[PDB]
Design a protein around this ligand. Structure first.
Ligand SMILES: Nc1ncnc2[nH]cnc12
Ligand SMILES: Nc1ncnc2[nH]cnc12
Ligand SMILES: [Mg+2]
Ligand SMILES: [Mg+2]
Lengths: 254, 254
């Protein structure tokens, strides 16, 4: 038996490896330019700014930082997805809670994520993690991040988890806390919720894809917001046939 | 019924859209820097240069150009993959040959690929396509490229297809022809064979992934070689369990 195709790609292929290394290379070059010249806008949206008319929290004189999602952005959850491939039970809240507590032995860095995290700190940029892992599992998450070669994270200062506020999986509140004390010059993630909660909680698969091509949002990709692949799970694996294949681009073999 | 997960991601998700827009943004910024200052090395490997010790064809005073694979790099083959999702017969040489001849009506641009192709030509950079589509289907391929908003391609000058030499799917010979008359400052692709044939024809899934992290090769991603996602088909969807999930990163739920 062979693993699911999405796992073959993300965890096995050199295509996905080069895809990840490219994103970090662009991130390191973008941060370096912002270290030499501090911008006026940070890369975190201001509160009340919709996807229709985007506006950002100002940078000011706050310390420079970069926000990262953890799972499948800087850290590969190889151990859990191996269990998902063996079982088929990918969506399991009880199994994932155990993985958050006992998975520090089976984690790997996204290709180049350990190298960029060191470069960001040698550049004087603080590395902040904003993950939907549970606040109750903060200590095993810190150990897993350390075991992935991603440095030392501290709960409340450089690590913000689900449950730190009364908003659940919504990360806008935690992004507001980070931007209130840091000037975030770059933000990485593998799901659109890692850049704005406005991509989720309503918009359809067709609407979310169009939202990324909003010219004010489109200018962010590779230029402030940095994306990494995840065809294994999450909000990217949704939609039926009429949403994946538009009816004006359909074809039948003879 | 829902389409395969990889197709949900690549063709439906906004995550894959932002992933593609990021790659082109980095490509446009890289090309602009090379227009202001022409480099000494092009991004095409010299003949006889192995992945162990990489070396590149010099740039010289040749016209600046950028090489692109077509399928799932600049053009989405929505119509064919819709047929693959309906049928399950993804690997079909007879059906794909028909798609090369009759698919110009069901193609779309990769997000931002039509915008970058115009920007490259407004910058004075020639856009060259190196695809494994058949040379016998060059004219319907030209029409499909045009229908995707990717400009005008010419067979033999800006379009090089499988069969133009006696090497089949190997693209190194066609890359040698392009680099002999152009200074290629950027090259995009969704499979590793779009950058060097040395990634294929032998190396295992584990070996190919490690090859992308060769420091001389690793410096190219997002900095000369630009990658786009394809978890739907190709050399990225290979390998068994021992190659996707290394044995030191395995885990079992309680
Ligand atoms: N339930 C889940 N939670 C988080 N990541 C996952 N990946 C696959 N299933 C998951
Ligand atoms: N046989 C094939 N040739 C090219 N692209 C494909 N995508 C899926 N199957 C394919
Ligand atoms: Mg994640
Ligand atoms: Mg291709």
């Amino acid at each position: 038996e062979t693993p699911p195709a999405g796992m073959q790609y993300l965890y096995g292929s050199g295509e996905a490896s080069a895809l990840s290394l490219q994103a970090y290379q662009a991130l390191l070059a973008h941060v370096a330019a912002k270290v030499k010249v501090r911008p006026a806008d940070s890369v975190i949206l201001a509160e009340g700014a919709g996807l229709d008319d985007p506006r950002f929290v100002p940078c000011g004189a706050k310390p420079l930082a970069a926000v990262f999602d953890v799972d499948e952005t800087v850290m590969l959850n190889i151990g859990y997805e191996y269990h998902a491939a063996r079982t088929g039970r990918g969506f399991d809240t009880a199994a994932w809670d155990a993985w958050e507590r006992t998975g520090e032995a089976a984690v790997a860095p996204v290709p180049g994520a350990d190298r960029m995290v060191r470069a960001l700190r040698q550049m004087g940029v603080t590395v902040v993690f904003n993950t939907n892992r549970a606040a109750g599992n903060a200590e095993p998450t810190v150990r897993a991040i350390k075991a992935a070669g991603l440095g030392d994270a501290v709960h409340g200062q450089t690590l913000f988890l689900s449950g730190d506020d009364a908003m659940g999986s919504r990360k806008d509140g935690r992004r507001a806390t980070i931007a209130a004390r840091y000037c975030v010059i770059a933000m990485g993630g593998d799901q659109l919720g890692d850049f704005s909660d406005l991509f989720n909680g309503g918009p359809s698969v067709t609407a979310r894809r169009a939202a990324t091509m909003q010219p004010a949002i489109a200018q962010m990709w590779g230029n402030g917001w940095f994306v990494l692949p995840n065809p294994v799970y999450g909000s990217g694996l949704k939609g039926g046939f009429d949403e994946v294949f538009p009816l004006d681009k359909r074809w039948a073999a003879p």
